[PDB]
Chain A
Amino acid sequence: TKPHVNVGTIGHVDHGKTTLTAAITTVLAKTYGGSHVEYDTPTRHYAHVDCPGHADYVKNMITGAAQMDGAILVVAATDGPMPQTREHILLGRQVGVPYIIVFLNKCDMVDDEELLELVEMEVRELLSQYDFPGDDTPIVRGSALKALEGDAEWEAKILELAGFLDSYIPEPERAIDKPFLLPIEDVFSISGRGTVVTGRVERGIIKVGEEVEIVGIKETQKSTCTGVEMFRKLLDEGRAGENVGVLLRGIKREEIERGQVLAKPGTIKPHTKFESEVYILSKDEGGRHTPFFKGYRPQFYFRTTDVTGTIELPEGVEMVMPGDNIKMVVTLIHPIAMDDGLRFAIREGGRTVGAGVVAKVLG
């Protein structure tokens, strides 16, 4: 099964994002066969969305929609970068898109070679001003429309773009290849055997005899996996996506808690304070009816459990309404296993009123 890559187009409303995406699908189908669009290259499967709005993209990046593995910045060669091109790239840095490829569109309408270089140079500099590697950035000179109409010379440029998607965007890491992690849901003691914790393996593989750390809420503890089982049948290993029970040596069941995480040693740490991008559900989405303020004291649901936290609103912000998305610094009342990019729900009285993503761990 070929690797899945999430990409998106971003750029001016008239510079050809939709035409490009149509050209990509058409040319790739014509060559390789086969709300989002999907297309295939020989080695990869792509899922492609558009990013027409800033807040709209952030909200979807929070409420579940896949985060881009890479973005295609579409700039018409006739105009060059617009003033709002800064905002397009700034979104990229904000949501931490790791790679940006540039498609210079409408090159079928610009003769002067020296002007194309001025456009390219401006783009590379804008990119670099927001700490993307402008000098190393792939910049394809094409024509989406002419390619879409079947002009072979420009169809080649669509293929050139696909080539950079294949080579310049690193193969996304499969969950089973990441370091082992299992969110603990329940804990049982089995007299004669020992302690078993249950959960769904979030990533990696846990095998009998391997050491694990128990991370979050309490002091980190170490143990060894003395068995993995599913439906009362002993496995040799538990893999990412499987619901298993992991038998531990030495640990008593009073020493493990729901909300803790089993993990490959040294690979994840507990924290209490972080920066996040947060989205608050509107009333129609089943959220709060009323706004909240600086003393709001909700629960942050990480994987399997609530952790109460206090919040710091950005300067200049004293109120948060239902339907808003904002940045906030959160301080949990006790630590939880976390790293950048970890998603969470915001709850009150056990009811979800929002969602967020950890953007930067602080303490």
Chain B
Amino acid sequence: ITASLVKELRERTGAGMMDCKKALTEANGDIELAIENMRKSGAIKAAKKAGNVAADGVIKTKIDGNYGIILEVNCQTDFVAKDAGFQAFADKVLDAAVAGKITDVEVLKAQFEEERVALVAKIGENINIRRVAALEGDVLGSYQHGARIGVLVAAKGADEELVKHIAMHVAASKPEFIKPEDVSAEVVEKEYQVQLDIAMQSGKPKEIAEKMVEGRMKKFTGEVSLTGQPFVMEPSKTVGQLLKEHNAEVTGFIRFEVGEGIEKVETDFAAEVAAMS
């Protein structure tokens, strides 16, 4: 076991220097066996990292005709999110999700678990295929706001530029409904009672409050729906007005943002250093 051989194993796997020597030594110099052994060791290294909050990473999107996939792959730092190895992994997962039309993230996770483990073993951060979704439509378009936000939009009667602008709008304005009439009556009813309660305690007379809340309901459904929001590139019109102008229609959209619903860990460097002192 020489420095050259250790250098070769590290060149092939990117594994830590000492992990490489240990693996080569137990394999008695066999590169291929050392590699196979590191698969076993790597699974436990990944397991130790699995508890680490992975709130950074990338959103990726890929369209294949009438089928589109949006994907979140997480890591711990944006340094790793920019890395070529991490990027190639997320891209590979994305490709497989599209080719096989895989929308069950557990199926996706299972297919790439060994590759994920090999990657975690060399990068040393928790990495996780977090979620995947498909969108289907007549015309599909995507928008990536860096690696942080991804959007798919399905549309009818809309050219490439229009679809792109709407996806950019969705990236910025985060609607959760296509049209205001899509908001269920139950949701509107609950929200009505919320606003009426707020209005009442503020001292507004019942008859005035009820009329004001009625106005707020039109505001509410317009604000959570795509067609009801002001177009971010020309806010003097709503997206709905924009679509009517182009004889077009939006049939679906999905917006992923990296780290949504993951509690951000608040770190204090000075304090953590002081503690160790």
Q: Are A291 and B232 in contact (CB under 8 A)?
A: yes
Question: Using a CB-CB cutoff of 8 Å, which residues 177-219 of chain A contact chain B?
Answer: none
Segment at the interface with A among B128-136, B177-185, B200-208, B265-273 = B265-273
Which residues does chain B contribute within 8 Å of A25, judged by CB atoms?
A: 273, 277
Q: Are A118 and B273 in contact (CB under 8 A)?
A: no
Which residue from B77, B123, B269 sits with its C-beta under 8 Å from A36? B269
A77 and B76 CA atoms in complex are apart in Å by 22
How many B residues face the partner with a CB closer than 8 A?
Answer: 41
Question: Using a CB-CB cutoff of 8 Å, which residues 66-120 of chain A contact chain B?
Answer: 77-80, 82-84, 86-88, 91, 109-110, 112, 114-115, 117-119
Segment at the interface with A among B13-21, B27-35, B152-160, B219-227 = B13-21
Q: Are A319 and B171 in contact (CB under 8 A)?
A: yes
Q: How far is the CB of B92 from chain A (nearest CB, A)?
A: 16
Which residues does chain A contribute within 8 Å of B123, judged by CB atoms?
A: 82-84
Is A52 interfacial (CB 8 A cutoff)?
A: yes
Residue of B nearest to A323 (CB): B148
A165 and B18 CA atoms in complex are apart in Å by 29
Which residues does chain A contribute within 8 Å of B233, judged by CB atoms?
A: 293
Which residue from A84, A115, A148 sits with its C-beta under 8 Å from B80? A84
Which residues does chain B contribute within 8 Å of A54, judged by CB atoms?
A: 77-79, 82
Which residue from A26, A52, A53 sits with its C-beta under 8 Å from B277? A26
Which residue from A49, A53, A78 sits with its C-beta under 8 Å from B79? A53
Which residues does chain B contribute within 8 Å of A109, judged by CB atoms?
A: 18
Is A19 interfacial (CB 8 A cutoff)?
A: yes
Is B3 interfacial (CB 8 A cutoff)?
A: yes
* B 248-260 binary contact with A (CB < 8 Å = 1; else 0): 0000000000000
Residue of B nearest to A109 (CB): B18
Is A318 interfacial (CB 8 A cutoff)?
A: yes
Which residues does chain A contribute within 8 Å of B85, judged by CB atoms?
A: 83
Q: Are B122 and A35 in contact (CB under 8 A)?
A: no
Q: How many A-B Cβ pairs are below 8 Å?
A: 113
A242 and B78 CA atoms in complex are apart in Å by 42
A69 and B80 CA atoms in complex are apart in Å by 25
A86 and B83 contact, Cβ closer than 8 Å, known pairs A55-B78, A78-B18, A319-B145:
yes
Q: Are B122 and A321 in contact (CB under 8 A)?
A: no
Which residue from A37, A77, A82, A88 sits with its C-beta under 8 Å from B269? A37
Q: How far is the CB of B182 from chain A (nearest CB, A)?
A: 24
* B 140-171 binary contact with A (CB < 8 Å = 1; else 0): 00000100000000000000000000001001
Is B99 interfacial (CB 8 A cutoff)?
A: no
Q: Are B17 and A80 in contact (CB under 8 A)?
A: yes
Which residues does chain A contribute within 8 Å of B18, judged by CB atoms?
A: 78-79, 109-110, 115
Is A22 interfacial (CB 8 A cutoff)?
A: yes
* B 69-112 binary contact with A (CB < 8 Å = 1; else 0): 00000001111101111100000000000000000000000000
Is A50 interfacial (CB 8 A cutoff)?
A: yes
Q: Are A52 and B267 in contact (CB under 8 A)?
A: yes
Is B187 interfacial (CB 8 A cutoff)?
A: no
Which residue from A26, A118, A318 sits with its C-beta under 8 Å from B17? A118
Which residues does chain B contribute within 8 Å of A55, judged by CB atoms?
A: 78
Q: Are A13 and B21 in contact (CB under 8 A)?
A: no
Q: Are A52 and B77 in contact (CB under 8 A)?
A: yes
Which residues does chain A contribute within 8 Å of B16, judged by CB atoms?
A: 78-80
A321 and B171 CA atoms in complex are apart in Å by 10
* A 28-59 binary contact with B (CB < 8 Å = 1; else 0): 00000001110000000000011011111000
Q: How far is the CB of B42 from chain A (nearest CB, A)?
A: 14
Q: Are A21 and B79 in contact (CB under 8 A)?
A: no
A55 and B276 CA atoms in complex are apart in Å by 27
Q: How far is the CB of A21 from chain B (nearest CB, A)?
A: 5
A37 and B270 contact, Cβ closer than 8 Å, known pairs A13-B124, A22-B277, A110-B18:
yes
What 4 A-B pairs have minimum CB-CB distances, sorted nearest first? A79-B16, A22-B276, A87-B79, A80-B17
A-B contact pairs, 22 of them (CB 8 A): A22-B277, A25-B277, A26-B277, A35-B268, A36-B270, A52-B269, A53-B56, A53-B77, A54-B77, A54-B78, A83-B80, A83-B84, A87-B79, A87-B82, A110-B18, A115-B3, A115-B17, A117-B3, A290-B232, A293-B233, A319-B168, A321-B145
**A residues in contact (CB < 8 Å) with B:** 12-14, 18-19, 21-22, 25-26, 35-37, 49-50, 52-56, 77-80, 82-84, 86-88, 91, 109-110, 112, 114-115, 117-119, 148, 290-291, 293, 318-319, 321
